[PDB]
Amino acid sequence: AAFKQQQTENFKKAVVARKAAKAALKKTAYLRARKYSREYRGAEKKLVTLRRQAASHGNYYLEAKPKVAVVTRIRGIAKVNPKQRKILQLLRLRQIFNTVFVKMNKPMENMLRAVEPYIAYGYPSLATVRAMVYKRGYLKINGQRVKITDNQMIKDKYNNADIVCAEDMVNQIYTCGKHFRTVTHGMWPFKLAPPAGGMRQKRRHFVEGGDYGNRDTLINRFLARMI
Amino acid sequence: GVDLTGISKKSRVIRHHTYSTNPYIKLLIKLYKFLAKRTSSGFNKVVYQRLIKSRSNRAPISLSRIAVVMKRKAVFTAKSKAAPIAVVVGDVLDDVRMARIPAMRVCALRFSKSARQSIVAAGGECLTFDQLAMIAPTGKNTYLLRGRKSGRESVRHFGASGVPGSHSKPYATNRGKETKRGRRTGRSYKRKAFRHV
Amino acid sequence: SHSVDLQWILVRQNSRFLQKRGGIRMSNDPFNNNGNWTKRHCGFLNEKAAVVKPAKGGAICVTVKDGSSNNKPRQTYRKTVHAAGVRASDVSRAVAAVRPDLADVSFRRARRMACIASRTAKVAAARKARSEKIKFSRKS
Amino acid sequence: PKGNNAIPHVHQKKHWNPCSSQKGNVKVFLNQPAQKHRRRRLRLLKAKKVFPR
Amino acid sequence: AKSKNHTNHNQSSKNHRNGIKGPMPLHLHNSKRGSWLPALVNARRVRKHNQKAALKKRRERIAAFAAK
Amino acid sequence: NGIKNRRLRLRLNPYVKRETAAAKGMRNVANRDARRKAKMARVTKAKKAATK
Amino acid sequence: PTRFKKCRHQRGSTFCGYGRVGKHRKHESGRGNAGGMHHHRINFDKYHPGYFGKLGMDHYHRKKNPMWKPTINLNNLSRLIAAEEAAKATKGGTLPVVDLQSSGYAKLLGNGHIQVPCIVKARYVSKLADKKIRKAGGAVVLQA
Amino acid sequence: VKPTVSKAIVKKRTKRFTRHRYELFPQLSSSWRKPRGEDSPVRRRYKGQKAMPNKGYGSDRATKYITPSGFRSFPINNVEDLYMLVMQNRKYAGVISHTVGARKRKAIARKAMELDVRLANGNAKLRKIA
Amino acid sequence: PVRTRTLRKRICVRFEHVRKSRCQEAFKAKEHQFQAYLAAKKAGKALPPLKKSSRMGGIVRPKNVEVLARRVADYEA
RNA sequence: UAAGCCCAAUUAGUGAUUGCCCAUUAUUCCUUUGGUAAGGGCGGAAACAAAGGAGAAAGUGUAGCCCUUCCGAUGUAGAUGUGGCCUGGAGGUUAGGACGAAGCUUAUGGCGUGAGCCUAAGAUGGACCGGCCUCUAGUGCAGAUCUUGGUUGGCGU
RNA sequence: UGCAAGGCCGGAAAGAAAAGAAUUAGAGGCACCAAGUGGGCCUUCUUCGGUAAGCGGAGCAGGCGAUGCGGAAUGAACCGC
RNA sequence: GAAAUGAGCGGAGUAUUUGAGCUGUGCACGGCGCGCACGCACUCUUCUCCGUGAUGCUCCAUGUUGGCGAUGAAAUGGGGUGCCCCCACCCGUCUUGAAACACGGACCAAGGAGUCAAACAGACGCGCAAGGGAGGAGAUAUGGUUGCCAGUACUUUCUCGUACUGAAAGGGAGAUGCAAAAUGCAUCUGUGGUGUGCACACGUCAUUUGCCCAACACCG
Ligand SMILES: *O[C@H]1[C@H](O)[C@@H](N)[C@@H](O[C@H]2[C@H](O[C@@H]3O[C@H](CO)[C@@H](O[C@H]4O[C@@H](CN)[C@@H](O)[C@H](O)[C@H]4N)[C@H]3O)[C@@H](O)[C@H](N)C[C@@H]2N)O[C@@H]1CO
Ligand SMILES: NC[C@@H]1O[C@H](O[C@H]2[C@@H](O)[C@H](O[C@@H]3[C@@H](O)[C@H](N)C[C@H](N)[C@H]3O[C@H]3O[C@H](CO)[C@@H](O)[C@H](O)[C@H]3N)O[C@@H]2CO)[C@H](N)[C@@H](O)[C@@H]1O
Ligand SMILES: [Mg+2]
Ligand SMILES: [Mg+2]
Ligand SMILES: [Mg+2]
Ligand SMILES: [Mg+2]
Ligand SMILES: [Mg+2]
Three-state SS for chain B is: CCCCCCCCCCCCCCCCCCCCCCCCHHHHHHHHHHHHHCCCCHHHHHHHHHHHCCCCCCCCEEHHHHHHHCHHHHCCCCCCCCCCEEEEEEEEECCCCCCCCCCCEEEEEEECHHHHHHHHHCCCEEECHHHHCCCCCCCCCEEEECCCCCCCHHHHHCCCCCCCCCCCCCCCCCCCCCECCEEECCCCEECCCCCCC
Q: Which of A178, G54, G92, H127 shows the shortest CA–CA distance to B186?
A: G54
Rounded to the nearest whole angstrom, what is the distance from the C-alpha of residue B136 to the centroid of ligand 5? 61
Beta-bridge partners for A103: A68
| Residue of B104, B143, B140 whose CA lies nearest to B122 | B104
Task: Calculate how close chain D gets to B5, using CA atoms only, in Å.
Answer: 29
Phi and psi dihedrals of A139, rounded to 5?
-130, 160
Q: Is there a contact between B27 and C9 if contact means CB atoms under 8 Å apart?
A: yes
Burial class (CB in 10 A: 0-12, 13-18, 19+), C7: middle
Calpha distance E42→A211 (Å, rounded): 70
> Which residues make Cβ contacts (< 8 Å) with residue G86, sequence separation at least 6?
B99, G78, G96, G116
In 10 A of CB A56, how many CB atoms?
Answer: 14
Residue H106: half-sphere exposure toward Cβ, Cα within 13 Å: 2
Cβ distance of I7 and B196 shorter than 8 Å: no
Q: What is the dihedral of CA G118, G119, G121, G123, to 10 degrees?
A: 80
CA-wise closest residue to C42 among C72, C19, C60: C19
**SS3 assignment for B117-169:** HHHHHCCCEEECHHHHCCCCCCCCCEEEECCCCCCCHHHHHCCCCCCCCCCCC
Q: Running DSSP on this structure, what letter comes out for residue A72?
A: E
Please indicate if any CB of chain B lies within 8 Å of the CB of D9: yes
Give A11 to chain B, closest Cα distance, Å: 19
Which residues neighbour B106 within 8 Å (Cβ) at sequence distance 6 or greater?
B66, B85, B86, B87, B88, B92, B119, B124, B125, B126, B127
How far apart are alpha carbons G71 and G101 in whole angstroms? 10
Cα dihedral value I65, I69, I73, I77, nearest 10: 100
Which among B56, B28, B57 is positioned nearest to B128, based on CA atoms? B28
Resolution of the determined structure in angstroms stands at 2.5
- Rg, C-alpha atoms of chain F: 18
Rounded Cα distance, A48 and A216, in Å: 19
Task: Round to whole Å and give the CA distance between C52 and C59.
Answer: 11
Nearest CA to A116 out of A182, A37, A215 is that of: A215
In the PDB record, what is the listed experimental method? cryo-EM
Angle CA B52–B56–B61, to nearest 5: 95
Q: Which of A202, A163, A196 is nearest to A179 (CA)?
A: A163
CB atoms within 10 A of CB F33: 9
SS3 assignment, position C25: coil
Nearest to B85 by CA among B60, B101, B108: B108
**Chains sharing 3 or more CB pairs under 8 A with chain B:** A, C, D, E, G, I
Residue type, C43: G
Indicate if CB(G6) is under 7 A from strand L.
Answer: yes
DSSP-based three-state secondary structure for E64: helix
Report how far apart the first and last C-alpha atoms of chain E are (Å, whole number): 89
Residue I35's H or E segment, with its range, is none
Residues 6+ apart with CB under 8 A from A76: A96, B1
At CB < 8 A and 24+ separation, what contacts does B26-33 make? B26/C9, B27/B130, B27/C5, B27/C6, B27/C9, B28/B109, B28/B129, B28/B130, B30/C5, B31/B129, B31/B130, B31/B133, B32/B129, B32/B133
Report CA torsion sign: A219, A223, B2, B4.
positive
| One-letter identity of residue A23 | A
| HSE-CB of C130 using CA atoms within 13 angstroms | 7
Are A30 and F14 in contact, with CB atoms under 8 Å apart? yes
To test ligand 1's pocket by mutation, which of B9, B15, B158, B197 has the most ligand atoms within 8 angstroms of CB?
A: B9
Chain L: positions less than 7 Å from a protein CB are 5-8, 17-23, 29-31, 35-41, 44-48, 50-53, 55, 59-61, 71, 77-79, 87-96, 98-100, 107-109, 114-131, 136-140, 143, 150-151, 161-164, 167-169, 171-174, 176-177, 183-186, 188-195, 198-201, 210-220
Give the integer Cα–Cα distance in Å for B84 and B43.
Answer: 13
Q: How many CA atoms lie within 13 A of E58 on its CB side?
A: 9
DSSP calls for A46-71: HHHHHHHHHHHTT-EE-PPPP-EEEE
- Report how far apart, in Å, the C-alpha atoms of G77 and of each of B48, G111, G116 are: 39, 11, 8
Crossing angle for the helix pair A126-134 and A166-174, nearest 10 degrees? 140
Ligand 2 mean position, distance from CA H53 (Å): 56
Q: How far does E12 lie from chain I, in Å, by closest CA? A: 8
